[PDB]
Structure formats: structure tokens, C-alpha cells
Amino acid sequence: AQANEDIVVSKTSLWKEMQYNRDITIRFKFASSIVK
Amino acid sequence: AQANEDIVVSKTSLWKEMQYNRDITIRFKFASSIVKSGGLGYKWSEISFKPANYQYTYTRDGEEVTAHTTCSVNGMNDFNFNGGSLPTDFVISRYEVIKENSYVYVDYWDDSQAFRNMVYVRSLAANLNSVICTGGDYSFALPVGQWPVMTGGAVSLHSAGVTLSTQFTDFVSLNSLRFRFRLTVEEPSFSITRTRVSRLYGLPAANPNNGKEYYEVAGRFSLISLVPSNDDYQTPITNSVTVRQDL
Amino acid sequence: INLPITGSMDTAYANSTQEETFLTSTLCLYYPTEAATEINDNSWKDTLSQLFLTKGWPTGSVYFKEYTDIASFSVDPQLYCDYNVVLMKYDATLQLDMSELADLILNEWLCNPMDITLYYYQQTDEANKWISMGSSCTIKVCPLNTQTLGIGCLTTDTATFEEVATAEKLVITDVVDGVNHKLDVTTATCTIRNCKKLGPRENVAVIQVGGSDVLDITADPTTAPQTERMMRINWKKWWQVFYTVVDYVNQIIQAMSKRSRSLNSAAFYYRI
Amino acid sequence: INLPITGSMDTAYANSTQEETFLTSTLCLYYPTEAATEINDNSWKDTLSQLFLTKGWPTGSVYFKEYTDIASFSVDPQLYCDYNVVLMKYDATLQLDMSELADLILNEWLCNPMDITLYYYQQTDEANKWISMGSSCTIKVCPLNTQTLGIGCLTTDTATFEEVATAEKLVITDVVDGVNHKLDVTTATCTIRNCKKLGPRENVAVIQVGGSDVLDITADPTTAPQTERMMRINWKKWWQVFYTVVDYVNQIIQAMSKRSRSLNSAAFYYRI
Amino acid sequence: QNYGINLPITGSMDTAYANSTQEETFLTSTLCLYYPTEAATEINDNSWKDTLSQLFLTKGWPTGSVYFKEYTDIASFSVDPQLYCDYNVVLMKYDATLQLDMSELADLILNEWLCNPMDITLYYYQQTDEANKWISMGSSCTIKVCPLNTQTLGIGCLTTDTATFEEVATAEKLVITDVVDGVNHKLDVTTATCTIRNCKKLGPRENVAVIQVGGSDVLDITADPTTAPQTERMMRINWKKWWQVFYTVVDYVNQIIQAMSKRSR
Ligand SMILES: *[C@@H]1O[C@H](CO)[C@@H](O)[C@H](O)[C@H]1NC(C)=O
Ligand SMILES: *[C@@H]1O[C@H](CO)[C@@H](O)[C@H](O)[C@H]1NC(C)=O
Ligand SMILES: *[C@@H]1O[C@H](CO)[C@@H](O)[C@H](O)[C@H]1NC(C)=O
Ligand SMILES: [Ca+2]
Ligand SMILES: [Ca+2]
Ligand SMILES: [Ca+2]
Ligand SMILES: [Ca+2]
Ligand SMILES: [Ca+2]
Ligand SMILES: [Ca+2]
Ligand SMILES: [Ca+2]
Ligand SMILES: [Ca+2]
Ligand SMILES: [Ca+2]
């Protein structure tokens, strides 16, 4: 089992149920609003 | 094949892949934002673009089709002209111009069957014709003295890639078709009269329409979307927005 | 008639139906203005009728119909007679035009109309073509792909279309059969019709008055045939032309044969 | 192979080899710069490829090769494909030139070089001709009697010679067979070769886009033939010509047949 | 006299050994040497061709049957070689900086290729079998290739940005390119100066004979790195002069032309 897999837990004529298990690095940031 | 075909390339019980191949008349329009700094009136703060909506109703081959278009610009260049530090010299802190490195986006939407429940699209492609966007004449209304006029500017819009987008507005939200346009600078240049600036290509962001009601360009688009088999389903269009309450 | 016919090789050859088909049939010539101009006579029609009277055609059976030019005749021709002869002047600057005229009158066409705005058409077989008539026809075509967009052309920008005709009175157009074409036509001045080429028209007879045989009826390049009713003459006057036609009118009408399809005064049948 | 072949008449007609020869063969058009000019499009090659694709010819099998002039093409024509089509304009002032071109590409030649200064050559049969290529050939020849003297010419005075070409890019020279000729050629710009005409090249198909049939492939003034891979169109545009060639390419390839002799890119074999 | 057809030929084993065709194939055939400019330079004579032909005369090759055709260098000869004679010999110098050049030359002349044309701008090509290659000639060829995937997109390269392409050739006069068989490749080539042709290798050309004048056997004709053959018409020599080389070629021309057999085509 990989770290960034991609599986198909079902499949119909057009749609499909896929499973995704993936690692991420959330590089977020705040921002302030000053009012004088 | 008709010019406004609608074909089915696959159909399961509830869903169906419907192909659409249709002609369109994109009538769009720029819109400019003019912010003038305080003091006497000799300094302008910004002359920039604002995404501009325009809804119209045109005639198809024996049908009346209502539409909704939204023009925007990306990657514009920010020029400026400052002739003095005193309150009586005409200065423009930042004004926008369009050149090759910029792009012109146009979101398009109709009341037709193609855009009724469109959330998924593949095999997207379009044949668009090229047009020429010419700027107008904006008279900087100074308090006293002379009246410089930013006049001129021509630039040719050529067809480019196509994508999807979402037109958000205070009334309707539309899952729409995004046509891109690239720019090739034309011969008519824009120049601020009674000033030391002239013979510079591009389009000015003060009066791009040139007193026109819109810019017209005809096209054709071809896609394949997912539509429920039952031709009675409806996706929410209208809105009631209360965003930016802090603002 | 679906039924068959039977016969035998022992029966006898009947008498000549000539000298009766003349009486109970009409003949019509199509001459250019140039002929009457070079002639400068006002009774040449009655003269030629009195001459035909010796060959057997009675007085009120021959007719003459002027046409100022090959193209002005090509603009919606109307052959309404029982035996038509056409005299056609040769000019290398008009070769394809006076071959299209041949392809139109010598053959028998079944034509449907065409609505370019609402529809995009295509040719099924090697006998379907698009024939367009009017005062100035400028025809451009953009072939299309599986998804109804352009191939080396833009479905809207008519400059990117491919020009197959430039201010032509009669155009016969064949395109790649099996693909859909979007058309641009001077519909104000020209009508275009999707026409199928049926069996030939044995009622008419073209006579090229000048140069060597060039008419290629068949749009395919391999055949280049020469039918029996496609004649040639070498000329320096027009009175000699008409005297030759009158002297050898029996051979011409033996090379021609009355029609079987229907009664029709146009150069093409209409079936909507 | 020298052995014989045997067969029957009960054996059955196998399926159509068309729709597989298209996949396993190549097609190559030779068009004039006039056509590219009148078209004024930079995607018509891809257009025609996508069109042919419906006729069965796959993408990477169709090729187009621009040739600016009939004479420039006549200068060592290099055909290396399995099915060659040539579109040839008509000009009275170039009649013999575009006839020699046909005579050269339609037929298969076996060529030895010629050393004018050191040796003196003759023709043996009615198929041993002297073909000269180059940018400007001006050829002169002196026939010689039994005792190696001149006849109406002198072995030294190049002005007494008999001129047969005047700055011609391709010439095919047939002289009396049985007598030795002393030649004078602009060897700096032209090469001349003693060639023998073999059986025909069935890989090429000439298409005279314009006027009446003029090509006399055979040098003798008695046959004046018209082979099967030698067509004639009447034209006013070029897109119509190309659409026609496409719609009727199957008849063209049925009129052509892949070669038997060997693999070669030139229009003639070399055997020293 | 049936052409284009292949039929079974019969034979036996009690038939007698017919007379020698040598001393008649010489009279009814022509020979052609391809010598480098270095040799004439070292010689410094204007009658050596006549001398060699008068010598050949003793071996049976008459005056107007032998020919000499000069070439300045291996690559200048690699540019569109026209070997049009009944017997062809090619003297070839050895230089480690030109091993691939004089292997490609051998691969090109010793073997009989069936060459179809190519149009890079429109079409994207692939090699079907182990005998389909792309031979490019000209004065300066610079070839770059991008493999493509099932959906007509790149593999370690961008269909638009030519720089991303993988360079297999850099200013070569003759290149024989073999790429992976089964994947459509998009190409960029200096078509202004070079012409490229999709060529299938048929059976060999028995009408030519390469003679390597210097170093050991290096020519890897077969693209597959498993055979590494050495045919009968791939000869080798050691040299300190060129007159000795030409005398040797003359004195042993009979074995050379016994190793060479006239073409089938
Ligand atoms: C046909 O011609 C012959 C010879 O003139 C004549 O005797 C005969 O009566 C003709 N037939 C009829 C039905 O009159
Ligand atoms: C030959 O043609 C017939 C008729 O189309 C077809 O039924 C048959 O399968 C074909 N056989 C081969 C071997 O192509
Ligand atoms: C073949 O060689 C033998 C021995 O030299 C000779 O006697 C015979 O005549 C030769 N054959 C022919 C056809 O000359
Ligand atoms: Ca016409
Ligand atoms: Ca076009
Ligand atoms: Ca057709
Ligand atoms: Ca000539
Ligand atoms: Ca003389
Ligand atoms: Ca002769
Ligand atoms: Ca090399
Ligand atoms: Ca890369
Ligand atoms: Ca390979």
C-alpha cells in the first residue's frame, strides 16, 4: 500500500466510487485587518 | 447536421452523456474603475479594469435566446505618469494597459439546453473569429487649467484556448464557458493630449468601449456534458448574497 | 415498368421512322448572338425553316432561341422541345464553364433544395453534387470533423473558408464524400441545389464550333469520355455552320433519342 | 524470375485489396506553387490528410511535395513513394517540355553515362534515346558518314553543328539510328545520358489540370496514345481539383499498379 | 520472364560444375573504387589512375571498365552516397572520433534500404519492427525526439517547448536513428539543411565492399547489440603507405569480387 494511492471501490456505466489516501503539507497563513 | 445539434453518445438509466454543437454570439463589454485622489483634483489614484457583466437577448434560427456574458482582463501592465510633486501638476499614480503579455477572459452563458445542468464537460473546443478592440476618449476633468484627453488605442483580440468558469453575481450564479483571447498590438496608439506622452501601443483602461454598447464576436462551441436522462431537472441559478458584511 | 420485355432475332426490320418522327416532333436550335451579328439578316430563320422543309421537318416544327453568352445561358437553362441542338463557341477562358453547361444539359439531374443556415450537408455517392445558378455565385466550404468544428478553417470566420468559386454564373461542385461541409454562398444572387446525376438526357446535342474536344462531363479524372451527342466543327463563318447542320440533321437526330423519364421544361427535376 | 506461372478459371475472386493497400502503402502528390499561392493557407496539407483519412489512407501515408516549375521538376525528378500523383498545368509554350516530363516519369529508363569528348555514340533501336538534364542545356550534333567525316558539318567547327536544344532544362533527343553523332553540350551545367526505354512505370499518374490532350509519350509520330494513368481536368480553382483527386483517388490507384522492377528514387536506373 | 512473382526453382546434385564466369564477368562488368583525398595527396601523381588501369588490364579488367571516384572525407561521402556501378569498393580510414560515422556509412551502403519520405510538421511516427529506422542526411543534422503516450501527450518532454526534447544527434552529416518500437515520436529537425527518411532494412547489398585501411574491426552494423557481425565484404588492412594498399587491392581484386555478388534488385 502506497502513501498516495488511488483505488476504485466501485464502477458503474458512467460514474465510479474512488478512494484517495494522500499526504499533504498545509502551508497556511493568517492576515490582519487594521483600521485607524 | 444542424448548426444547433444535440446528440446522445451514451445513456444509462438516470444519467446520459449529451453532445452539443451550437453557434453563439458573444456580446461583451469592458468596464473601468476611476478613483481620483483628494486635494484639488490634479492627482488620480487608479484607472483600472473591473469585471463587467452584460445580459442580452439575441435571435437564433427561429428562436429567441437569452444570454449572460462577463468580461475580465488578466496580466495587464501598470503604467503611471508623474510630472511634478506639487498640487497643481497633472499626475496619474497608476493606470492599466493591455499588451501581448495580457489576456482577456470572457465567460459566456445562455438559457439553452447546453447550460441547464452543466457541471461536467469534456471534448471541449470552439471556433472563434478575431475582432479589434479600440479605446475611446476620456477627458480628465481638472479643476482649472487645460483638459488633457486620453484618446486612442487599438488592439486585436485573437481566439485562444477554452475552459469552464463560474459567473458569480448578486442575482444569478452560472456554470459558464470561459473563452480566452490573446492580444496583438495594432497601429492606432493611445496618447494623453497636452502632455509629454504619445506613440505607445496598447489599450487604455478609461474608455475601452469607445462609446459602444458592446463588442460583438460570433463563435461555435462543441462539448459533451452529463445531464440527467429526465429532461425536467434544474440546477440552482439565482442567488441572494450577503458576503463582505465586515466590509 | 418492373415487368420484362421479350423478342426475337427472326423478325423483320420495320420501315424508317424518320420522315414521321420529324413531322410529329419539334426541333430547336440554340445559337449565340455573334451568329446573327455576323449575319445581319432578318429572315434567316424563315430561310432555314424553308431549307429544313426539304429534309422533311415541316414549317412550324423548327425553332431558334438566341442566347447572348454561354454563361447567360447556363443561368437556369430551359430546354422545352423534342430535339435540341446547341452551338457552343470555344474559349480556353471558358473551358470549365462550357463543360459544366454540358454536364448540366447532356445529363438528367434530380435536385433537392439546400438550406445552408439551418443545415450542413454532405455528398453520399459519386453521383451526388451541388449545382448552383445565378448572376454571381461565390461558394466557399469548410469541411467538418466528428464534433462539428473546422478542419483547416474556422466555422465562423468566412475568410478562413476554402474558395471553390469566384463570381461564377453556374458552378458544379463535388467535395469529399463522407464529411459534412459548412457552406457560404451569395444566396441573395444564387440558388444552390443538391442534385443527383441520373441517366443521360438523349434529347439534346452539343456542337463545339471551334477548338478540339475538351468537355469532361464526368467529374472523375479517369474517364474523360466523348459521348455520341458531343460533336465538333471547325469554322470560319456561321452560314456554313448552319448549312452543315441542315445538311447533316439526319445524323444528329439519329445520334439523339427522345426521352423516357418524364415531361419537363427545366434542366433538372425537383423533388423537394 | 524466368519460370512460368499456371492457374485456373474456377478459383474464386478474392476480397478487395483496397482498404489494406491504403494502410500498407504511401501516396505522394506533386503540386505547383501556383496552387499554394491561390490557396494562401498554411494548413491545407493537414486538411487533405484528415480528408484522405475518411477514404482510408492513414495519417502518415499522405505526402505533398511542392515543385515551383515543370522544368525545375524535370531537372532530375526524384519520385520515392509507392503511389505518385502529379498535377501538371497546361501551357502551349511548354507543350514539348511537359510531354518529355511525362515520357520520362511515366516510363522506366535504364541509363548509361556519355563521354562526348573521348567517344562518339549512336542509337541502335527505337527506344535508345539521349536524355539531358540540367539548368540550361544547349545541344548540337553532327552526324558522321562511314569513314568518320562530317555530313553537313565539320568535326572541328562547333557552329556547323545542328542545334536541337536551346537552354532547355530537360531534353529527350532521338536521332537517326545506325549513324554515329559527334555532340556538343554545355557539360558544365548539364549531364547527358544514353538511356533505353523499358516497360512503363505504373507507380505514377499524370493529371493535366488544364487544356486538351497534347502529351505524345511515344516519340514515333504514329501512335499518339493515351494511357490509363494520364488524366485531364478542366479547372478554374485548385481546391476543386484537390477535392476531386481525393474523392476519386480510388479510381486513380485502380488505374495505377505498384512497380515490379526494383526500389529506386530516381526516374531512371543507372548501370554505367 | 515473370516479374514481381516468386516461384520454386528445382535442381539436382548430379549436374556437373559449369565453367568459370571470372575473366568474362570482368569484361562485361565495371568496377569502381572510392578512395580518399589523402591517398592522392600522398601519391602526388597525375597518371596513377592510368597506371592502376593498365595494371588491372593484366588481371582482365579492361581500360574503360575501371573507375575511380574521389571523396574528401568520410562524412562528406556519407552525405547521399551514390554507388552506381556493377562492382563497388570503398577504402575507409580509421579514426576513433569517427567510429560511429563509419559504422553508419557501412550500415547504409552494405545494406539495401527501402526508404519512404517523412513530414515532421504534420505527422508523428513510430518504428514497427527491428528493421525500421530513420536515416537523415545533409550538411548539418540536429535531431530531437519526444516519445508520446496513449493520449498524445509527452513523456519527459513538452509537445510545444522544443528545448525539452531529447537530443540524439548534434551536427552530424549522416545519422541512423533507432528509437523504441511502439511509441509515437514527435521530431524536430533542421529540415533547411537535412532530409530524413523512414527506411526499412531489406536484405544486404552484395555489390559494395568496405576496406578498413587502419585499426581493428569496429563496425557494429546491426543496431541490436547482440550480433556484432563481420560479413565477407568487410575487409581490413594495415597501412603505412597507399601505393601498397592499391597494389594489394589490384593483386587480390579476384577474391574481392568473389566476395561480392551482383545485386538482385
Ligand atoms: C417499307 O418499304 C418498302 C419498300 O419501299 C415498301 O414496299 C413497304 O410498303 C414499306 N412498309 C410499309 C408498311 O408501307
Ligand atoms: C470476402 O468477401 C466476402 C464478402 O464481403 C466476406 O463475406 C468474406 O468474409 C471475405 N473473406 C476474406 C478472407 O476477406
Ligand atoms: C570448361 O573447361 C574445360 C576445361 O578447361 C574446357 O575443356 C571446356 O571447353 C570448357 N567449357 C566451354 C563451354 O568452353
Ligand atoms: Ca462555372
Ligand atoms: Ca482554410
Ligand atoms: Ca462527390
Ligand atoms: Ca524540353
Ligand atoms: Ca550544318
Ligand atoms: Ca532514335
Ligand atoms: Ca554520423
Ligand atoms: Ca526532456
Ligand atoms: Ca527500432
Residue numbers in the entry:
A (entry chain 1): 248 to 283
B (entry chain 2): 248 to 494
C (entry chain i), D (entry chain g): 55 to 326
E (entry chain k): 51 to 315
What did the original publication write about this model?
We then used subparticle classification, starting with a total of 4,550,760 masked VP4 subparticles, to separate upright, intermediate, reversed, and empty VP5*/VP8* spikes positions (classifications #1 and #2) and to distinguish membrane-engaged from non-engaged spikes (classifications #3 and #4). Two relatively heterogeneous classes showed membrane-engaged reversed spikes, with apparently variable angles of spike contact (classification #3). A further classification step then yielded two maps from 56,593 and 70,018 subparticles (classes 5 and 6), respectively, with relatively well-defined lipid-bilayer density (classification #4). Virions that contributed subparticles to these two classes had on average a higher percentage of occupied spike positions (liposome-unbound rcTLPs = 48.9% empty VP5*/VP8* positions, liposome-bound rcTLPs = 36.9% empty VP5*/VP8* positions), showing that those particles had bound preferentially to liposomes. Even within these classes, variability of curvature at positions at which the bilayer bent away from the particle blurred the membrane profile around the circumference of the contact. Local resolution estimates for classes 5 and 6 showed a well-resolved, virion-bound VP5* β-barrel trimer with its central coiled-coil domain and a poorly resolved lipid bilayer. We have now shown, by analysis of individual spike positions on cryo-EM images of virions attached to liposomes, that VP5* trimers, in reversed conformation, interact with the lipid bilayer, recapitulating the interaction inferred from icosahedral averaging of much lower resolution cryo-ET images. The reconstruction shows that the central coiled-coil domain protrudes into the lipid bilayer, although flattening and distortion of the liposomes have prevented us from resolving protein structure within the bilayer.
Rotaviruses infect cells by delivering into the cytosol a transcriptionally active inner capsid particle (a "double-layer particle": DLP). VP4, activated by proteolytic cleavage into VP8* and VP5*, is the principal membrane-interacting partner; VP7, held together by Ca2+ ions at its trimer interfaces, is a Ca2+-sensitive “clamp” that anchors VP4 onto the underlying DLP. Accompanying or following the engulfment step is a large-scale conformational rearrangement of the projecting VP4 trimer (cleaved to VP8* and VP5*) from an asymmetric, “upright” conformation to a threefold symmetric, “reversed” conformation. A major consequence of the reversal is projection outward of the ~250 amino-acid residue “foot” segment of the VP5* polypeptide chain.
